[PDB]
Design a protein around this ligand. Structure first.
Ligand SMILES: *[C@@](C)(CO)[C@](*)(O)[C@H](CC(C)C)NC(=O)[C@H](Cc1ccccc1)NC(=O)[C@H](CC(C)C)NC(=O)[C@H](CCc1ccccc1)NC(=O)CN1CCOCC1
Ligand SMILES: *[C@@](C)(CO)[C@](*)(O)[C@H](CC(C)C)NC(=O)[C@H](Cc1ccccc1)NC(=O)[C@H](CC(C)C)NC(=O)[C@H](CCc1ccccc1)NC(=O)CN1CCOCC1
Ligand SMILES: *[C@@](C)(CO)[C@](*)(O)[C@H](CC(C)C)NC(=O)[C@H](Cc1ccccc1)NC(=O)[C@H](CC(C)C)NC(=O)[C@H](CCc1ccccc1)NC(=O)CN1CCOCC1
Ligand SMILES: [Cl-]
Ligand SMILES: [Mg+2]
Ligand SMILES: [Mg+2]
Ligand SMILES: [Mg+2]
Lengths: 222, 212, 125, 233, 204, 196, 195, 222, 195
């Protein structure tokens, strides 16, 4: 994976590639690594795929119940605290590496969480196998007082660096923009620079090519 | 691999499969596991593909040099012992070879020698070698008689490989048949298991475990 | 190691050391071989200037190389032992690898090959 | 079988329209200890080749001696030693590549990653990599260690394929290299601020720059970062 | 002693025009020894089809488990479970055993009875969902199946054409794997009819 | 890490670098290793980031609950809670923590807690991988009852050398001043401290 | 424990189980019956780790006999095999698993059909026309592939079984001291005394 | 401890026609998750209408190709400029490979050309020298993906004649150079999609009686 | 290779050697002669690592036959056993030792006495009235301690040997496919064809 997070004027943006690997094999060419914890708190996940999904849903569930209990919109630090304490308890065995971001009544926020339960604060962050390719771009082009459109460009450029240069990352670029006072916009497949070219030949077989031994109608009804 | 060769009234039958594996990866279905050393000598190949192929090719060169020097075809015993003495020099180095040197000479008659990479050399009437040797033995032993006809012996050899090709996951592809007589070896064709299995199942009425 | 080429060609195309080795054979006691229809017989001369000999223990002129092959000779007695020994070893080595005793032609060919090797090897006569 | 003791980190390089640029910092690390600070890891061979070496420094110094000796040996009985029969980058590389692979094959490797940058006699750019395993490859941009992970991505944005080489000037190319060196100083724990840079041009020849420093760094934003999550002071 | 490759086997699922196909081999072995040539790896709960590769004892255990859970679902909900919902149930159940997992590679396939949309999905052994428009693969010849499906597949295939594509994908992949084959079954699934075909393949 | 805490005339100053590493990669170059467990009780964190955070969070919780019942805790009390966690979970922790705080009665105090979980009250303390290189320097240059400006220079020069030699240390030099006046944060950038 | 075979024919299930009990370099017993009657028309043979085998077999037997008394009814071979599989499926993820492989031969009185189930220690169940555990299969399966027919009589099944035992006695390394053969049919379970 | 081997990834493919033969291979060179070169050729013209590729550990691959090229040179010197036949080349390569039986060249070797009857020939080697002539062979990282597709499309495996009740097989026939290149390109695009170590570029070398031609095609760079 | 026995009686030495050659789960041969004639009145049986056994046996045989031709004289069993021991004593400290255990049964024509020597792969020689290698000894030694007498005839020795083979066939785990028995006496070496 390659995942990034970038702060800007009036909020925060996160992004991710869409490759899912199984050893050297690409299992999913267009998986979604951006997760919704609450309406305006989103999470980019790298590492063990089942773990990032499971841990984000569990904390997202508890955040919803907490939001209903307290009659308040949930805060990023609550998700951050609940995630890190969960991950720390499991001593790194739950392999979730997360970039947690969002807006809440306190303001806009950007954090990262590692599998062992350590958290970091920053204006720009990157995790995953292609984090070094992404961080190289972020270190080269990031500045203070980014606009919305500049942060999206920087974020997607950092993901692209991972896509092209890291074998662990590829396919498309997902983006989620969380601006203060506005609804969070989830931009699924924001860029699709890896479209499969037309095949040279159709491999549609003549009907009857496959040898059959038996046929039977299957009963699905009661 | 599965390879066999047995001695009988009408000479020697030799049968082998043609599969080659690298773990669970089926690398080839068309490997020649019988080496034609000369018009009267055959060698079978099981174990490491390179080890067998390289050293049995080498054996053929040593047998050629024998008949140049001695003006006489090498004995099956002497040929098998060249190979066994060779692999014994490499004992412990990790060679993996399960071979059978089959042939006819005037002084010996039809003869089969089992030779393997840990130095074992055995004369015998029946041998099965390879990962599916036990499956071949099961069919071969239960149907073997010395008084088999050339036609029945050829079939039993073929059927024994087929049995192993079916059950053993690391055997298959096709069956290569050979018949060795006083006049030399005779090739009896390549038989793909893809067609041979169903042909045998129907005609013989066997393989009732499989969905027909 | 002693390297000198002792056996060499002369202007007239002769290897004198090989030819002088034949003179040593000509000096040696006579030996004869006659083969019949179903047998071979090896006859050997023993010079009678040596009385007070012990014939029990004195090296016999005819030597068994294997149970089926024999070797007699004429010439230097000490030299013959070296050939006989080499031949006997090769006889056992053949049985070990070929699983069959040597033919008389093969054993001869080996012995003859040893003799030849000493005609173009350095340091040896 | 070895283990590297005193080590040198990333060597980065790229092609541009008229030649090649190569750079490497001046550090000799002893594990986590930043032991030696005056180490030159770019070694020129003649006036047309520069060999950049990372990894074990004792082995680097051995390679220096071999290259030094190669120049001497080439001069022997060679009236055209400073002309047609001068040492080419391709000759120097193939020699090293032969040695590196022979040493790995004897299970006693020179624990290094090497990049031979230069310009051939016909004006063509030469840039090729070789390492302790004897593995060789060429590319418009080449880098070792952390450079491979962080520099290459940045340098490939300038020269992504062959056709981008004529379009890249020495000004643009050097700027990218100097930027990459800064990024490596931010992020590589065994890097130093001081570095050397070499340009081999087909027109202006060999330019060897010493005692360069990473500058125009962004650190100001650090003051705003407090705690690791909740903390507000 | 690698649980996922003791028994062997494969499953593949594809989508077509208003239809889905799911197929599997019939082999069950103990490493090199072939034991059974009748071991089907595809099950169904109502109109939702589940294929499972991997350790055979877990394949059986999970089938029995999902039959259990879907039966209770139906009694309480008073309707058949849908593929999207079942996929979530499989994921939940597998991740529940996160640190002592079932050694399996399940594959969901079916058509949503409300929307009529063809649906397929795959999972790893700890329940990570792998959703796909085109195809899902699983088993000891997954690499082979990935190669076959990626080249042979095209979108919007008719049920009769889709049958040929998925069958050829399975057959040729199985023939390059020692632990897969020994027969094969293909399910063609339309909105309100399901056809099951047994394929003739080489028996080695 | 390179961390230190130094007592002086008006109170105590904590100091730290800003480098977090995974092997030789710098995961964070602007880390804040100086963390608040109470108004005027802070700590320097070295070792595992996860462990030291988890510990500091628990200590902050304990001292907040202490304050609700018994009022402001002593710096010694804070160090005791750190010790209790580090000692009792020594098998599962990699944390080198320096506790520093300002009382009005006790003035500036520094307690260092190494891996084992032992407590050591000292005039000043150094810790973290890069501390090894400045034992010689700090011993020769430390004086009791220094001024604020002298103590800042002592920490700055010390961590500058630690950073210079230790690859595992770098970035900015953060400092936190604890006196009767209040809490002051200080930062010092490479361009300044490197050429000292 | 080593050789256990099973052959389902037209009207019966035949189980053959080796008599040897070796431990070390000593054959301690040569007349061991490696089977338990679970119910009047259900028989289970077993092979595996010492102690585990009998302990498991008797535990299953006790449970099936308890069911029979409670319901005054005999469980079907299919039902018994499913119960056994589940017990082994639990076992494999226990602190100390039962290392026992079993064959369950039974005659279903409701269907009037013989049934043979092969279950390994992992809980891997398969219904088969013929089955084996351990190294036996490597010889017998290929042999039965050839000679077995589905419509065979019990007498034909015994001859087919003799053919297996002969092959094993010829090619197996260890002396397993022959086999105890038992037949399961509509009339229940009986032992062949002369084999 | 020092490990003398490495994995440089990539994949190769050889197909034989009636009067021609192709040997294709991607141009990507990798170590772990990093790209070393997007264009590093590993299919070489070795003279005498023999093309060769030794995919796997590049250092061993280059060493072997280098040595075989040299073997061809000395074959000319020692045997009056005689043309090295493809069958003779294969046997020679077996001895090169087996020569290092106890410290192997970690490579899958494939050579292609024309046999002495003018017909297309492809030979493939394991790392220690076992070889076999075939109509078809894929080697390297994505060999497991490509090879079964080749069985189906080149050798018409599992394909029967429609309406013949799976009794008559699809008859074998030679493919045209145009049809073969279509299969090569589709094989490599498919392999690029699902294998991370395959991509960047595709270089095909075609061998006819006229000589050795080259064709290059772009592949996805993620 | 497994079972090799030896019994010295009044006027002869009797060697019994198992016929089985096993490898993996397959008995490859059941008529193997694990012995070589070193000279007309000296016989050596052997057992141990595959390949090593025959290679060593034939190497000794070649050396003894070479001696016989050279001197036109048969070496004494004592002399042969000492030669064999030295070869094994060298071997054990080689790069790759011969893992071969041997029994040397011979009849000394000068003494008119039978002699049995037991030599292990380390080069440990002992002259014995009865001997065995491998696990065989664990049964046969105690049996022979009881039943053996020094003045027994060859026929009594064969009955005593039958008693050993029976016990081994009863209690040994592996099927060794019977034995080839050979007798060494004043008249040389001969094989018992019906055992
Ligand atoms: C980049 C793309 C680098 O991987 C990202 O970091 C992504 C994160 C996204 C998907 C959220 N990472 C992966 O895709 C991740 C890489 C990985 C692999 C293995 C361990 C850790 C990380 N891949 C996965 O998580 C896949 C997702 C599947 C393809 C849907 N899962 C697997 O590879 C599982 C790993 C399961 C696991 C078990 C125990 C501890 C850790 C992980 N592996 C298998 O399924 C392989 N095998 C199949 C046969 O059954 C036995 C297991
Ligand atoms: C039956 C079919 C299976 O046992 C037979 O026994 C056959 C004998 C025939 C081929 C003569 N045996 C094999 O097929 C044999 C099994 C085997 C493999 C390895 C060691 C011992 C036995 N297979 C081979 O020899 C394969 C044949 C190739 C794939 C055509 N070769 C390899 O596996 C090679 C060489 C192995 C090797 C031996 C000694 C030293 C070094 C290497 N290995 C690879 O190709 C490695 N790997 C394959 C997967 O792709 C990545 C590279
Ligand atoms: C200096 C740098 C060293 O003393 C300081 O002490 C700082 C203290 C600050 C950050 C509070 N220490 C670190 O930066 C610390 C060094 C360290 C590493 C490992 C064990 C103990 C201490 N670094 C970390 O804790 C990082 C922080 C991450 C990058 C946010 N974590 C890792 O390096 C993890 C930790 C795993 C771990 C191991 C043992 C005990 C606890 C946690 N390590 C990895 O992920 C290993 N990694 C796997 C992939 O390949 C590269 C190595
Ligand atoms: Cl931290
Ligand atoms: Mg098979
Ligand atoms: Mg530093
Ligand atoms: Mg790719």
């Amino acid at each position: 994976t390659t995942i990034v997070g970038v702060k800007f004027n009036n909020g925060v943006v996160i992004a991710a590639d869409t490759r899912s690997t199984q050893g050297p094999i690409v299992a999913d060419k267009n998986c979604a690594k951006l997760h919704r914890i609450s309406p305006k708190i989103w999470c980019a996940g790298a590492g063990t795929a089942a773990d990032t999904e499971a841990v984000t849903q569990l904390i997202g569930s508890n955040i919803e119940l907490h939001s209903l209990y307290t009659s308040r919109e949930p805060r990023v630090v609550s998700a951050l605290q609940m995630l890190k304490q969960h991950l720390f308890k499991y001593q790194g065995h739950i392999g979730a590496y997360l970039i947690v971001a969002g807006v809440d009544p306190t303001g806009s926020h950007l954090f990262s969480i590692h599998a062992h339960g350590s958290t970091d604060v920053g204006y720009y962050l990157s995790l995953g196998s292609g984090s070094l390719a992404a961080m190289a771009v972020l270190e080269s082009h990031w500045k203070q007082d980014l606009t919305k459109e500049e942060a999206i460009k920087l974020a997607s450029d950092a993901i692209q660096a991972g896509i092209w240069n890291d074998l662990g990352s590829g396919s498309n670029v997902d983006v989620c923009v969380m601006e203060i006072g506005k609804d969070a916009e989830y931009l699924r497949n924001y860029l699709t620079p890896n479209v499969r070219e037309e095949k040279q030949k159709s491999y549609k077989f003549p009907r009857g090519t496959t040898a059959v031994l038996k046929e039977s109608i299957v009963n699905i009804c009661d | 691999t599965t390879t066999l060769a047995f001695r009988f009234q009408g000479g020697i039958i030799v049968a082998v499969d043609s599969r080659a594996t690298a773990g669970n990866w089926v690398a080839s279905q068309t490997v020649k596991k019988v080496i034609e050393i000369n018009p009267f000598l055959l060698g079978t190949a099981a174990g490491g593909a390179a080890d067998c192929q390289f050293w049995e090719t080498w054996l053929g060169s040593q047998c050629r040099l024998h008949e140049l020097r001695e003006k006489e075809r090498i004995s099956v015993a002497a040929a098998s012992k060249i190979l066994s003495n060779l692999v014994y020099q490499y004992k412990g180095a990790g060679l993996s070879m399960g071979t059978m040197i089959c042939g006819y000479t005037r002084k010996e008659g039809p003869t089969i020698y089992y030779v393997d990479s840990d130095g074992t050399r055995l004369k015998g009437d029946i041998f099965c070698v390879g990962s599916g040797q036990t499956f071949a033995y099961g069919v071969l032993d239960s149907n073997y008689k010395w008084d088999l006809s050339v036609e029945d012996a050829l079939y039993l050899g073929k059927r024994s490989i087929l049995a192993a090709a079916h059950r053993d996951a690391y055997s298959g592809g096709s069956v290569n048949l050979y018949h060795v007589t006083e006049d030399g070896w005779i090739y009896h064709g390549n038989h793909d298991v893809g067609e041979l299995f169903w042909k045998v199942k129907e005609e013989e009425g066997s393989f009732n475990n499989v969905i027909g | 190691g002693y390297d000198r080429a002792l056996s060499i060609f002369s202007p007239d195309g002769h290897i004198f050391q090989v030819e002088y080795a034949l003179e040593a054979v000509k000096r040696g006691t006579c030996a004869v071989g006659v083969k019949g229809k179903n047998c071979v017989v090896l006859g050997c001369e023993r010079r009678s200037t040596l009385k007070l000999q012990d014939t029990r223990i004195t090296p016999s002129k005819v030597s068994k190389i294997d149970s089926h092959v024999v070797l007699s000779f004429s010439g230097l007695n000490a030299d013959s032992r070296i050939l006989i020994e080499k031949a006997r070893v090769e006889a056992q080595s053949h049985r070990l690898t070929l699983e069959d005793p040597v033919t008389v032609e093969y054993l001869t060919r080996y012995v003859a090959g040893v003799q030849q090797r000493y005609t173009q090897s350095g340091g040896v006569r | 079988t070895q283990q590297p003791i005193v080590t040198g980190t990333s060597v980065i390089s790229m092609k541009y329209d008229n030649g090649v640029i190569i750079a490497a910092d001046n550090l000799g690390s002893y594990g986590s200890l930043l032991r030696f600070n005056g180490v030159e890891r770019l070694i020129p061979v003649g006036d047309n080749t520069v060999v950049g070496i990372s990894g074990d420094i004792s082995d680097m110094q051995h390679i220096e001696r071999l290259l030094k000796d190669l120049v001497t040996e080439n001069a022997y009985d060679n009236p055209l030693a400073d002309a047609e029969e001068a040492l080419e980058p391709s000759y120097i590389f193939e020699y090293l590549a032969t040695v590196m692979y022979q040493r790995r094959s004897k299970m006693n490797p020179l624990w290094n990653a090497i990049i031979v940058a230069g310009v051939q006699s016909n004006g063509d750019q030469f840039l090729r990599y070789v390492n302790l395993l004897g593995v060789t490859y060429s590319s418009p941009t080449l880098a070792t260690g952390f450079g491979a992970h962080m520099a290459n991505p940045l340098l490939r944005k300038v020269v992504d394929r062959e056709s981008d080489i004529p379009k890249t000037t020495v000004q643009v190319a050097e700027e990218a290299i100097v930027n990459a060196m800064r990024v490596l100083y931010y992020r590589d724990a065994r890097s130093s601020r001081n570095f050397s840079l070499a340009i081999i041009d087909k027109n202006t020849g060999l330019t060897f720059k010493k005692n360069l420093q990473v500058e125009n760094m962004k650190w100001d934003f650090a003051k705003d970062i407090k705690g690791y999550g909740t903390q507000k002071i | 002693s690698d649980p996922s490759s003791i028994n062997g086997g494969i499953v593949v699922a594809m989508t077509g025009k208003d239809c889905v196909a799911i197929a599997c081999d019939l082999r069950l072995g103990s490493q090199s020894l072939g034991v059974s040539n009748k071991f089907e790896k595809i099950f169904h709960y109502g109109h939702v089809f589940l294929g499972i590769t991997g350790l055979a004892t877990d394949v059986t255990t999970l089938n029995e488990m999902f039959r259990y859970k879907t039966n209770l679902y139906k009694l309480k909900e008073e309707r058949a479970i849908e593929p999207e919902t079942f996929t979530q149930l499989v994921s939940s159940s597998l991740y529940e055993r996160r640190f002592g997992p079932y050694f399996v590679g399940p594959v969901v396939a079916g058509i949503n009875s409300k929307s009529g949309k063809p649906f397929i999905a795959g999972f790893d052994l700890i329940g990570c969902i792998d959703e796909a428009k085109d195809f899902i693969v699983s088993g000891t010849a997954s690499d082979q199946l990935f190669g076959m499906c990626e080249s042979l597949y095209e979108p919007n295939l008719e049920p009769e054409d889709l049958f040929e594509t998925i069958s050829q994908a399975l057959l040729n992949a199985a023939d390059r794997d020692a632990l897969s084959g020994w027969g094969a079954v293909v399910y063609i699934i339309k909105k309100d009819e399901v056809v099951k075909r047994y394929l003739k393949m080489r028996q080695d | 890490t390179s961390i230190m805490a130094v007592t002086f005339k008006d109170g105590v100053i904590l100091g730290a670098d800003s480098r977090t590493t995974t092997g030789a990669y710098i995961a964070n170059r602007v880390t804040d290793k100086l963390t608040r467990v109470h108004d005027k009780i802070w700590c320097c964190r070295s070792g595992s980031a996860a462990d030291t955070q988890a510990i500091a969070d628990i200590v902050q919780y304990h001292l907040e609950l202490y304050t609700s019942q018994y009022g402001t805790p002593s710096t010694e009390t804070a160090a005791s809670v750190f010790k209790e966690l580090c000692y009792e979970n020594k098998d599962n922790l990699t944390a080198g923590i320096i506790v520093a705080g300002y009382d009005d009665k006790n003035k500036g105090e520094v307690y260092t807690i190494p891996l084992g979980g032992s407590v050591h009250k000292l005039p000043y303390a150094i810790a973290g991988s890069g501390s090894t290189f400045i034992y010689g320097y700090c011993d020769k240059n430390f004086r009791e009852n220094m001024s604020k400006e002298e103590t800042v220079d002592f920490i700055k020069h010390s961590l500058s050398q630690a950073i210079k030699w230790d690859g595992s240390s770098g970035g900015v030099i953060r400092m936190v001043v604890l006196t009767a006046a209040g809490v002051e944060r200080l930062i010092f950038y490479p361009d300044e401290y490197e050429q000292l | 424990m080593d050789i256990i075979l099973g052959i389902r024919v037209q009207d019966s299930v035949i189980l053959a189980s080796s008599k040897a009990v070796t431990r070390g370099i000593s054959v301690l017993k040569d007349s061991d019956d490696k089977t338990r009657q679970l119910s009047p028309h259900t028989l289970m043979s077993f092979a595996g780790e010492a102690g585990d085998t009998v302990q498991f077999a008797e535990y299953i037997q006790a449970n099936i006999q308890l069911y029979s008394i409670r319901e005054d009814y005999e469980l079907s071979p299919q039902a018994v095999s499913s119960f056994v599989r589940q017990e082994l499926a639990k076992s494999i993820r226990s602190r100390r698993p039962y290392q026992v492989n079993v064959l369950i031969g039974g005659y279903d009185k409701k269907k009037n059909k013989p049934e043979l189930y092969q279950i390994d220690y992992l809980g891997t169940k398969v219904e088969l026309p013929y089955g084996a555990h351990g190294y036996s299969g490597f010889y017998t399966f290929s042999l039965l592939d050839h000679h077995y027919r589905p419509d065979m009589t019990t007498e034909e099944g015994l001859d087919l079984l003799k053919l297996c035992v002969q092959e094993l006695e010829k090619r197996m390394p260890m002396d397993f001291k022959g086999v105890i053969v038992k037949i399961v049919d509509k009339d229940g379970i009986r032992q062949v005394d002369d084999f | 401890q020092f490990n003398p081997y490495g994995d440089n990834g990539g994949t190769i493919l050889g197909i034989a026609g009636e009067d021609f033969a192709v040997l294709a291979g991607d141009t990507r060179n990798i170590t772990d998750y990093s790209i070393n070169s997007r264009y590093e050729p590993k299919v070489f013209d070795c003279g005498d209408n023999i093309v060769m590729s030794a995919n796997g550990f590049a250092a061993d691959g280059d060493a072997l190709v280098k040595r075989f090229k040299n073997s061809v040179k000395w074959y000319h010197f020692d045997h009056n400029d005689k043309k090295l036949s493809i069958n003779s080349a294969a046997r020679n390569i077996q001895h090169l490979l087996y020569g290092k039986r106890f410290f192997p060249y970690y490579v899958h070797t494939i050579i292609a050309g024309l046999d002495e009857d003018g017909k297309g020939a492809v030979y493939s080697f394991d790392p220690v020298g076992s070889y076999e002539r075939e109509q078809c062979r894929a080697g390297g990282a994505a060999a497991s993906l490509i090879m079964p597709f080749l069985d189906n499309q080149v050798n018409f495996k599992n394909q029967y004649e429609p309406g013949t009740n799976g009794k008559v097989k699809k008859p074998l026939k030679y493919l045209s150079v145009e049809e073969v290149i279509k299969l090569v390109r589709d094989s490599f695009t498919s392999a690029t999609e699902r294998h991370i170590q395959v991509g960047d570029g595709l270089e095909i070398l075609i061998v006819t009686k006229d000589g050795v031609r080259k064709e290059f095609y772009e592949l996805k760079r993620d």
